[PDB]
Amino acid sequence: QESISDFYWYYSGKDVIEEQGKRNFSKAMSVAKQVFNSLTEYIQGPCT
C-alpha cells in the first residue's frame, strides 16, 4: 500500500501515465488482488 501510494505521488504530477508505469501498476495491482483474495479466504466463514 505504501509503495503504491508513493507511485501515485510520483505520477500525479505527470499528465498521462507512460506504458512502463501502466505495466508496473498492473503487476503491482495484480499482486494486491492476490493478497486481498488471500485475506478474504482467511476470513471467509465464521472464523472469529
Place this chain on the structure above:
Amino acid sequence: ICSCCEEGYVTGGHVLRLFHGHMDECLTISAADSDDQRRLVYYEGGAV
C-alpha cells in the same frame, strides 16, 4: 501536549485575566512608573 485538554477549560500555558471581583477587577502588577518597580499586585480593574 497531553491533548486531553477539555474544551473550554483552563489547562495551563494559556495566559488569562484573573478577574478577582465580579467584573472589571482583574489582578494586575504595579504601575510602570510606580516606585514599587512593578513588584506588588493589585485588583485595580476598569480600563486596565
Place this chain on the structure above:
Amino acid sequence: LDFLRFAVFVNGESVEENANVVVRLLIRKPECFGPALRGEGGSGLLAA
C-alpha cells in the same frame, strides 16, 4: 575512492542516481572524509 569514481562517472558523464546515493552515504558516515574534513577537528584540507 577510485572504485567509487568509476562507479559514479561513466562515458564522460556523471550518473545522477549513483552520484546521489554515494554522496548520501558519504554524509551519513562523516568518518569516510578523513581527518581533514572531520567536523570536530576542523583541520582544513589546505592545512592537512
Place this chain on the structure above:
Amino acid sequence: VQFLRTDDEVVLQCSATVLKEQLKLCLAAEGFGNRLCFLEPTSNAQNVPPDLAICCFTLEQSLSVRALQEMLANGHRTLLYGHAILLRHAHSRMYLSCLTTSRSMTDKLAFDVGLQEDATGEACWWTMHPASKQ
C-alpha cells in the same frame, strides 16, 4: 498507546548527561530579534522555572517524502516514521527551518537552525527516522 498526529502542540525535548546530571533541555527561539534557536533547560524547574511559550511548536502538517517533493514542485493525520513534518512556533508564528548561516566556530561544516517566516523552501521540513532498531 498514543501516537503524535497533525495539529498537536509538541515541545522538542533532548537529553544530555553533562557532568553526570542527565539534564533535559528543549528547543526554543525568541523569533523576534533572535530567530536563532537554542536549548533552554527544563530539567531544573524547582529552583528556576523554565519558560515554555518560546518552546511550544505546533505540528502544522505531516507528509510523505514523495508527496513533499510534489508539493515543493507545485484531518489529524497520524505521524509515522519516514515522513517530513512542519513545525510552527506558537509565539513567533514562523516555521522551524535550517538556516544556511553557520555560526559554529567549532564545526564549520555544521549549519544553524532558526525560524523562517514562510514555509516556501524545503529547509523548514524535517523527516524523522527510527532511532532504535526496535
Place this chain on the structure above:
Amino acid sequence: ALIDLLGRCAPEMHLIQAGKGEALRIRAILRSLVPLDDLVGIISLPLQI
C-alpha cells in the same frame, strides 16, 4: 581521490540550469563540504621543480 569523487558526483550543468531540487541540493551539500579558499590554496600550492 575524495575530492575527485565529489567533483564527478556533482550534478550535470543541464540539471543545474534546469534547477532540479535534488540537483541544487546535492550541489549545495558539496559546496558546504568543500570550501573555496582551501581549493584555491591547493591550486596555488607551490611545487618543487
